[PDB]
Amino acid sequence: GKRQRMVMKLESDKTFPIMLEGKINGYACVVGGKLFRPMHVEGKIDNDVLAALKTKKASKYDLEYADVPQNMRADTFKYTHEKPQGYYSWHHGAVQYENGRFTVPKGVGAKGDSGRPILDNQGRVVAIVLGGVNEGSRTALSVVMWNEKGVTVKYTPENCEQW
Amino acid sequence: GKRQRMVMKLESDKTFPIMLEGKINGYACVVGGKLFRPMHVEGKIDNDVLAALKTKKASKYDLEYADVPQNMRADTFKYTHEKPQGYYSWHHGAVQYENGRFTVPKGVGAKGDSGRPILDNQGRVVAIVLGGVNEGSRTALSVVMWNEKGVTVKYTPENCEQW
Amino acid sequence: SICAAIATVSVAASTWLFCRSRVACLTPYRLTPNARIPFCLAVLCCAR
Amino acid sequence: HAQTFTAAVSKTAWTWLTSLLGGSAVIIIIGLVLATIVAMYVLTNQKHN
Numbered sequence: 283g284k285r286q287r288m289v290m291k292l293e294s295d296k297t298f299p300i301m302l303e304g305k306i307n308g309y310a311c312v313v314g315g316k317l318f319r320p321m322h323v324e325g326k327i328d329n330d331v332l333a334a335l336k337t338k339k340a341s342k343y344d345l346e347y348a349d350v351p352q353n354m355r356a357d358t359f360k361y362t363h364e365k366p367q368g369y370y371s372w373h374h375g376a377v378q379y380e381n382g383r384f385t386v387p388k389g390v391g392a393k394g395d396s397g398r399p400i401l402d403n404q405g406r407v408v409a410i411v412l413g414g415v416n417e418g419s420r421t422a423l424s425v426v427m428w429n430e431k432g433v434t435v436k437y438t439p440e441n442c443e444q445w
Numbered sequence: 446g447k448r449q450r451m452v453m454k455l456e457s458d459k460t461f462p463i464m465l466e467g468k469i470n471g472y473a474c475v476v477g478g479k480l481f482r483p484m485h486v487e488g489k490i491d492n493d494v495l496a497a498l499k500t501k502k503a504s505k506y507d508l509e510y511a512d513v514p515q516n517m518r519a520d521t522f523k524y525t526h527e528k529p530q531g532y533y534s535w536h537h538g539a540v541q542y543e544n545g546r547f548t549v550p551k552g553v554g555a556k557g558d559s560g561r562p563i564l565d566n567q568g569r570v571v572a573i574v575l576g577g578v579n580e581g582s583r584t585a586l587s588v589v590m591w592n593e594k595g596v597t598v599k600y601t602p603e604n605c606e607q608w
Numbered sequence: 609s610i611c612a613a614i615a616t617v618s619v620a621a622s623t624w625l626f627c628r629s630r631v632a633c634l635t636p637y638r639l640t641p642n643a644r645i646p647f648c649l650a651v652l653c654c655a656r
Numbered sequence: 657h658a659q660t661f662t663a664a665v666s667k668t669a670w671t672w673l674t675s676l677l678g679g680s681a682v683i684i685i686i687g688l689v690l691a692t693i694v695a696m697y698v699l700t701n702q703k704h705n
Contacts, residue, residue: 381642382705385519418516429704437705440515477641503635510639524641589639597639 285371289401293373296359298332300325300397308445309397313359313407317348320397320412322444343426343436344412344444359399361407363428370408371401377423383437384409384423391421396445400425412436413444448534452564456536459522460562461495463488472560475513476522476570482509483559483575485607506589506599507575522562523569526593533571534564540586545600547572547586554584558608563588576608630654 300308300323308323310332317332321344327333331354337346350358370377370384377400378385384400391414400409409425417439424442429435462469463486471486473495480495484507490496494517500509513521533540537553540563547563554577563572572588580602587601630653637645637655645655 415515417519420519422519431701431704433701433704435702435705479641479643501638503639505632505635506639508639521641591640595640595642595644596636598636 286373286375288405289371289373292359292401292405293399295357297398298328301328302326306394307396308394311359311397311399311407311410312350312354312357313399313410314361315350315355315358317350318397318410319346319348320344321346323396343434345410345426359407360405361428362402362404363408363430363432365402365408365427371403372411373398378420383439384411384425385417386414386421386423388416388419388421391416391445393445411445413442415439415442449536449538451568452534452536455522455564455568456561459520460560461491464491469557470559471557474522474560474562474570474573475517475520476562477524478513478518478521480511480513481560481573483507484509486559506597508573508589524591525565525567525569525571526591526595528565528571528590533566535574536561546602547574547588548580549577549584549586551579551582551584554586554608556608574608576605578602578605 296312298310298312299306300310300319302325307325308320310317310319310327310329312318312332317335317337319327319337321339321341331351332348335348337348339346365379367380368378370379372386373395374386374390396412398411399407400411402408409423409427412424412426414421414423422439422442424436424438426434426436459475461473461475463471463473463482465488470488471483473490474481475495480490480498480500482490482500484502484504494514498511498514500511502509528542530542530544533542533547535549537549537558541548559575561574562570563574565571572586572590575587575589577584577586585602587599587605589597589599592598633649633653634645634655637643637649643656649655
């Protein structure tokens, strides 16, 4: 429960829910100085400054990137590409990273918890959750991430449902 | 002793015996999301989910092999290319690995001993037993295995018996 | 008739040896639990 | 004499029909080759994980 306190205290400032008729459908993430928002999530950004923007579309990677004003570029997530195997710290507890795939134990994951970042033990974002499929006792995840070259990579398992 | 009990705990979940008319002829392994079955063993897999799946055949490596359904993919074994010399585990006690040869002290290994996955000191499958020959006071085995490149390698000593 | 017979036997035997060689190349990569076919052999032997 | 079809086509006009119709095929095949190389390079970039 100690890692989930860290995730909630880092999401209290830098994560914004995308509300449609009050209902949560997704989360905009401000990482590295650029706003991120998925395509299929419908609604508006909770923050008033971020809602009045012109988000350039990128339909392949299921993202709608934007740019952050200069007074807000220090209040962003830090991020990295470095990802050894083991455990990472999601919003609902922990998430296993094995063979280049983020897996969460089952039950959790429904319509609405998309766009949530995955943190490491230092406090840096390594992935952004878009969707996932339930492989029985454990749910694989479809995320975007980065690499050592500096290239945004999206991983997508089979038959993933958009969250 | 102690080593065999965690192997029984693993084999109770994922290693499935075949059903000849009154007895057990062989054992289907579910590793990495790909069901494995030896050829000379004939019968029916105990699960009605694993029975209906049509298998592709590889006569050089003596194994039928089909793809496992999506729910079962998380509840599979794991496989390892790297094996150092020493001692590995097996359902009938221990198995020695020396000069690339899985050998077993004699008195054990007979008919109905096929498809049993040789585990390691962590719980990952390094080989699959298909039979062996009595090399004097200690029997060697005829297993398939994997290497660093991703190439299924079968080793077989002289005049082995299809168990 | 003998030209047609030699042509049919040659095309059938060459197609049989080609299928044997394609199976003998693609078999050690389809048996692995991940089935990660390398890209050049997937371009050549028409794999997934 | 007999008027063959394409009898008076005047090699200048053969050049104008070869350039403005065959050259557009050259444009579309180098566009298709460029698109194929771009798709393979994007897949090579995403081989990194």
